[PDB]
C-alpha cells in the first residue's frame, strides 16, 4: 500500500480539521444559501440566529423539532467542536443528525428548512462527515436549486459518480441518470437500508414514496432482459416490498402493490412466491383504496404465472383469509366493472377453492361464471371438479342448474368430461 | 521394485485429490496442506506458491489430513504419519486391522477414528515433547450411543473433552477418564459435517438436508437453525475477522455466505467447483483475514477475498460481494499427452481427456495456466 | 456550600461548559444453567506460575495452583478477550395469516 494511499487515508480522516487559514476559508465558504464571499466573511452568531428563527418556525409547523432546539441548537451548540470530542460523543452526534435529517426530508420546500439545515452544515460539517444520509434524504427533490447546491458543495461518496458528472454544471440531473444510479446493485442495498429506517421511524411521505417506487419500476424495466440480473435482484426489491407491506400506511401499501405487480409481470416467479405475496398482502390489508389496489394486484399475479398446476385450488388458510377480507358482492361488482380486467386464472382457482371448501354459494358461483368470459381448459377443470363434488355430496338443484348452464354453454364439453370419467 | 536409475521426485498439475485440506500458520506465513493421492503438498497462502512436498510416497492413499503449528499429520490405510516439512519423521501404527477415517489433535492428545467406530487416543510422552507417540488409551462407540463417526472436534475451553459427531447425535468424551460425559438429543437428519465456532461451546452441524444446526453444548440445545432446501451441506466456516458471516459449502457445488447478525444472506457463488466431482469439498476462512480458500474435487484450489464496503456510513449493511482472487488448478481427467515447451525445462504442455490444454510450470507451481480456445478471426 | 442554581447557569454560560449538551446527546433517543457437570473436572487442580501463558492469565502474585472450575472461568475470560462476543448468539435465539411469509420464502429459495 503506497505511501500516497496511506496519506490519502489520513487526509480523509482529517478532512474536517482546519489546520490553517486557507483550509478554513474553504470549509467555511461551503454553504447552502450564501455564495462564497459572504459565506467566508460571516460568523457563527449570525448563522445561528437565523437558524433559531427558522427552526422556531418549523417547530410551529410541527412540534417534533423542539428536541433538536434542545440538543443541537443551543448556545452550547455554538460553542462545541466536532474534532475535539471523543469517539462516543461523535457517535451521539451522528445519531442526532441522522434523526434530524430524517425529519427534515419532508419539508425541503420551505426556506425555514433551508436556513436550519444551513446552520447544521456550517457548524457540524455534515456535508463532509456524513453525506450519504444527506443525499439519501434529499434525493427525491432532484429537480430543485436546493439539490443543485447540495451537489455543488458536497464531496461525493463513491456510489454517486453519476451526480459527480453533473456537479457544477447548470442543468439538473435527469431521470435517466437517476435510473443508472438506482440500477447499481450496491446502491440498492443502501437505499433499502434507508427505507427500512424511514419505515421503522414511521417517517415516510407521498412524494418520497412516489420517487422510490418509480425508480424501482424503471430499474426492473431496464433490467428486463438480463435474467441473471433479475434473479439476483429479486431478493432486494421483494424484501423492500415485504417491509413496505408490513407498514400500515395506505401509501406504503399501494407502493408495494405497484412494485410487486411490475416485478411479477416482468419475471415469472414461482407458485410458492406468488402464494406468499398473496398471503402477506391479505394479512395487512386495511382500508378501501388499499383493498382496491390489492385486488388488482392479485388478479395480475395470477394472470402472470403459468405452469403445471397453473390454476390449482388455493390452500385453506389463504382462501379463508381472502374470503374474510373480501366479499362475494365486492368481487362480483369488481367483475361487473366496465374495464373488467382479465381475472381468468385467478377466478378459476377461486371457484375451484370454493367448490372444495364451502359447497354453499353455488349460486354466486353461477353468477361468476355468467359474468366472466372463461376459456376452454379452465371450464373443463371446473366441470371435472364439479362432477367430483356431485358424486360426493348430495345432488343439488343449483348444482344441476350449473350443469344446465353448461348445457346452454357447451354441453359437449360436459359430454367429453363425463365420458372420460363417468356415465 | 525399486529402480537403480530413476527415482520418483514429485507430481505436477495436482492441487487437491478430493480429501479436505487443512490450514495452519507459521508465524505470519499462512499455509495450506492438501493431499494428492499417495502424497501431500504444502502451499503458501499469500501467493499460492509451493513450500513443501512429501518426499516419501505413502504405500496407500492418504485418507485424512490435519496440521498443528509445524507438523502435518497424515492418516492413510492403517497408520498415522507425523511429518515435518514433508519429511516423514515418525510413524505411528494402529493396533487394529481397520482403517483410520478421522483425525484431530489438541494439547498433548492426538485422537484418531477408525471405521469400526473405534477411537484411539495417543499422548505425548512428555509435556514439552513435540509430537504424540505414546498410546494413551482406546475407546469404542456402539450403536446404542450413536451412529457412524462423522467427525471429531475439540471445542475451545474443554479439559480433555473430545467432541465426537455421529450420524445421529453428539457425544462428549473425557479421555483422561475414558468416559462418556454427556450425550446429545437425537437429530432427525443424518449429520454430514461439523465445525467449532469462534464463540464458546457452539458447534455447527450440516445435515444431508438443507439444515445447519448451530448447537450449544452446555445448554445442550439448538441455538439456531438455518434452512437451505434441496442441498447437501458439505463444509462450514466462520469469519473470525470481526464480522459474523458463515460460509456454507453445498455439495451441489455452491457457496453461501450468510450473516448471522441479521439472519441474512450476503451472497451466493454458483459452480465454484465441478459438481460431478463432489462440489465444494472444503471451504475455510483464513483466521483473522477476509480470505476464503475453497478446494474442490476437480483438482482446483481457489482464494476469494472480501473487499471493504463502499458505503462510508452503512458498511456492514452494504457489504461487498466476494471478488475472485488467486488460484491454482490441474486436469480433471488424467492427461492424454505431454511435451516439454522449452530446453530450459520450465514449462510442460499436457492435454487431457477433459478436452483441455494446459501448461504447467516445473519450478514453483504458481504457473498452472490453461491455454485458451478463442478462435482468431479469419 | 453548594452553588446556587442561577450561579450554576451563569457559570455554564461564562465557561462554555457543554456537558449539558453532551448529556442530552447521550440521553437522546428517537421518540417518534448448564446441562451436565463433571466431578473430576471440578476437583482437578493445575499449577499456575510454571508457564508464561498461565502467568499472564492469573491475577494473584503468590498463587501457584487453582482448581479446574476457577481455571476454566478465567481461561474462558481469556478466550473471550481473544474473540469478542457477538450479538447474534449473545442476545438472540430461535427456540390469521402472518406478515413475514414472503420474507421466509425469500430466505428459503435461490
Amino acid at each position: 500500500s503506497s505511501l500516497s494511499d496511506q496519506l490519502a487515508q489520513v487526509a480523509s480522516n482529517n478532512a474536517t480539521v482546519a489546520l490553517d487559514r486557507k483550509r478554513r476559508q474553504k470549509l467555511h465558504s461551503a454553504s447552502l444559501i450564501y455564495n462564497s464571499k459572504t459565506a467566508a466573511t460571516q460568523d457563527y452568531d449570525f448563522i445561528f440566529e437565523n437558524a433559531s428563527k427558522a427552526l422556531e418556525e418549523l417547530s410551529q409547523i410541527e412540534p417534533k423539532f423542539a428536541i433538536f432546539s434542545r440538543t443541537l441548537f443551543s448556545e452550547s451548540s455554538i460553542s462545541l467542536d466536532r474534532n475535539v470530542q471523543t469517539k462516543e460523543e461523535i457517535k451521539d452526534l451522528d445519531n442526532a443528525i441522522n434523526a434530524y435529517l430524517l425529519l427534515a426530508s419532508s419539508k425541503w420546500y420551505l426556506a425555514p428548512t433551508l436556513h436550519a439545515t444551513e446552520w447544521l452544515v456550517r457548524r457540524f460539517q455534515i456535508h463532509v462527515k456524513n453525506t450519504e444520509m444527506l443525499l439519501l434524504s434529499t434525493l427525491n427533490y432532484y429537480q430543485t436549486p436546493v439539490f443543485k447546491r447540495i451537489l455543488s458543495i458536497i464531496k461525493l461518496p463513491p456510489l454517486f459518480n453519476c451526480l459527480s458528472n453533473f456537479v457544477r454544471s447548470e442543468k439538473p440531473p435527469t431521470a435517466l441518470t437517476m435510473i443508472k444510479l438506482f440500477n447499481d446493485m450496491d446502491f440498492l442495498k443502501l437505499y433499502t437500508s434507508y427505507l427500512d429506517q424511514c419505515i421503522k421511524h414511521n417517517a415516510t411521505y407521498t412524494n418520497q414514496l412516489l420517487f422510490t417506487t418509480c425508480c424501482f419500476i424503471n430499474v426492473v424495466a431496464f433490467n428486463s432482459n438480463n435474467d441473471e440480473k433479475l434473479n439476483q435482484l429479486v431478493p432486494i426489491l421483494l424484501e423492500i416490498s415485504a417491509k413496505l407491506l408490513a407498514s400500515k400506511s395506505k401509501d406504503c401499501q399501494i407502493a408495494a402493490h405497484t412494485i410487486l405487480v411490475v416485478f411479477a409481470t416482468a419475471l415469472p416467479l414461482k407458485k410458492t412466491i406468488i402464494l406468499a405475496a398473496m398471503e402477506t398482502i391479505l394479512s395487512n390489508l386495511d382500508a378501501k383504496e388499499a383493498k382496491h389496489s390489492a385486488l388488482l394486484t392479485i388478479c395480475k399475479l395470477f394472470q402472470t404465472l403459468k405452469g403445471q398446476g397453473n390454476v390449482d385450488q388455493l390452500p385453506s388458510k389463504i382462501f379463508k383469509l381472502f374470503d374474510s377480507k373480501f366479499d362475494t358482492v365486492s368481487i362480483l361488482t369488481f367483475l361487473d366493472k366496465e374495464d373488467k380486467p382479465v381475472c381468468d386464472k385467478f377466478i378459476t382457482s377461486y371457484t375451484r377453492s370454493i367448490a372444495r371448501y364451502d359447497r354453499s354459494k353455488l349460486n354466486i358461483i353461477l353468477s361468476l361464471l355468467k359474468k366472466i368470459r372463461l376459456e376452454r381448459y379452465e371450464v373443463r377443470l371446473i366441470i371435472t371438479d364439479l362432477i367430483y363434488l356431485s358424486e360426493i355430496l348430495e345432488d343439488k338443484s343449483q348444482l344441476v342448474e350449473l350443469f344446465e348452464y353448461f348445457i346452454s354453454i357447451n354441453e359437449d364439453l360436459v359430454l367429453k368430461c363425463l365420458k372420460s370419467l363417468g356415465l | 521394485k525399486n529402480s537403480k536409475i530413476f527415482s520418483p521426485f514429485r507430481i505436477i498439475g495436482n492441487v487437491s485429490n478430493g480429501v479436505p485440506f487443512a490450514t495452519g500458520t507459521l508465524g505470519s506465513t499462512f499455509y495450506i496442506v492438501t493431499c494428492v493421492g499417495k502424497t501431500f503438498q504444502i502451499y503458501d497462502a499469500n501467493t499460492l506458491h509451493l513450500l513443501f512436498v512429501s518426499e516419501k510416497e505413502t504405500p496407500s492413499s492418504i485418507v485424512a489430513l490435519s496440521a498443528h503449528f509445524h507438523y502435518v499429520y497424515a492418516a492413510y490405510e492403517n497408520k498415522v504419519g507425523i511429518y515435518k516439512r514433508g519429511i516423514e519423521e515418525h510413524l505411528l501404527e494402529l493396533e487394529t486391522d481397520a482403517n483410520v477415517e478421522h483425525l484431530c489433535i489438541f494439547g498433548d492428545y492426538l485422537c484418531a477414528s477408525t471405521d469400526d467406530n473405534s477411537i484411539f487416543i495417543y499422548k505425548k510422552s512428555d509435556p514439552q515433547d513435540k509430537y504424540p507417540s505414546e498410546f494413551y488409551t482406546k475407546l469404542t462407540v456402539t450403536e446404542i450411543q450413536g451412529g457412524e463417526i462423522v467427525s471429531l472436534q475439540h471445542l475451545a475451553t474443554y479439559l480433555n473433552k473430545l467432541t465426537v459427531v455421529t450420524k445421529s447425535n453428539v457425544l462428549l468424551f473425557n479421555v483422561r477418564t475414558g468416559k462418556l460425559v454427556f450425550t446429545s438429543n437425537e437429530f432427525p437428519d443424518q449429520i454430514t459435517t461439523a465445525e467449532p465456532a469462534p464463540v464458546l461451546d457452539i458447534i455447527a452441524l450440516g445435515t444431508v438436508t438443507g439444515e445447519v444446526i448451530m448447537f450449544n453444548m452446555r445448554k445442550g440445545k439448538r441455538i439456531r437453525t438455518i434452512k437451505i432446501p434441496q442441498s447437501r451441506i458439505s463444509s462450514l466456516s466462520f469469519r473470525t475477522d470481526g464480522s459474523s458471516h458463515l460460509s456454507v459449502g453445498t455439495s451441489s457445488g455452491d457457496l453461501i455466505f450468510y450473516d448471522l447478525d441479521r439472519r441474512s444472506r450476503i451472497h451466493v457463488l454458483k459452480n465454484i467447483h465441478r459438481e460431478s466431482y463432489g462440489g465444494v469439498t472444503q471451504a475455510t476462512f483464513l483466521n483473522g483475514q477476509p480470505i476464503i480458500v475453497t478446494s474442490g474435487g476437480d483438482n482446483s484450489l481457489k482464494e476469494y477475498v472480501f473487499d471493504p464496503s463502499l458505503s462510508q456510513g452503512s458498511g456492514d449493511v452494504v457489504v461487498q460481494p466476494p471478488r475472485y482472487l488467486r488460484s491454482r488448478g490441474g486436469h480433471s481427467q488424467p492427461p492424454s499427452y505431454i511435451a516439454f515447451a522449452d530446453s530450459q525445462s520450465h514449462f510442460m504442455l499436457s492435454a487431457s481427456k477433459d478436452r483441455s490444454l494446459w501448461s504447467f510450470s516445473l519450478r514453483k507451481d504458481a504457473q498452472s495456466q490453461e491455454m485458451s480456445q478463442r478462435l482468431h478471426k479469419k | 456550600p453548594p452553588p446556587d442554581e442561577e450561579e450554576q447557569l451563569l457559570a455554564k454560560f461564562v465557561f462554555g461548559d457543554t456537558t449539558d449538551l453532551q448529556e442530552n446527546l447521550a440521553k437522546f433517543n428517537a421518540d417518534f444453567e448448564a446441562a451436565w457437570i463433571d466431578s473430576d473436572d471440578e476437583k482437578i487442580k493445575v499449577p499456575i506460575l510454571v508457564t508464561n501463558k498461565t502467568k499472564k492469565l492469573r491475577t494473584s502474585y503468590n498463587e501457584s495452583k487453582i482448581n479446574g472450575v476457577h481455571y476454566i472461568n478465567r481461561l474462558r475470560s481469556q478466550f473471550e478477550k481473544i474473540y469478542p462476543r457477538p450479538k447474534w448468539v449473545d442476545d438472540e435465539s430461535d427456540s390469521n395469516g402472518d406478515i413475514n411469509a414472503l420474507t421466509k420464502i425469500l430466505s428459503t429459495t435461490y
Binding site: 500500500s1 463513491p158 456510489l159 459518480n161 453519476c162 459527480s164 458528472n165 443508472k180 447499481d184 450496491d186 446502491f187 | 500458520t25 505470519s28 499462512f30 497462502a45 499469500n46 498443528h68 489433535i105 489438541f106 494439547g107 498433548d108 492428545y109 509435556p127 475439540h154 475451545a156 475451553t157 474443554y158 479439559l159 480433555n160 483422561r176 473470525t240 483464513l286 483466521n287 483473522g288 483475514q289 477476509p290 480470505i291 477475498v305 473487499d307 463502499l310 471478488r323 482472487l325 | 473430576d40 476437583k43 482437578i44 487442580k45 493445575v46 501463558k53 498461565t54 495452583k65 481455571y71 481461561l75 478466550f79 481473544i82
Partner: peptide, 28 residues
C-alpha cells in the same frame, strides 16, 4: 461514469489465535 470497483492488494496481517495446548492440562 459508473461506480469504480477498484481491486487492491490484500496483506494478511498477524492472526493471533488460541492454544489447544493451554486447553489440555495435567491432573492434580
Amino acid at each position: 461514469p459508473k461506480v469504480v470497483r477498484e481491486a487492491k492488494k490484500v496483506e494478511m496481517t498477524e492472526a493471533r489465535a488460541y492454544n489447544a495446548d493451554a486447553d489440555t492440562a495435567k491432573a492434580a
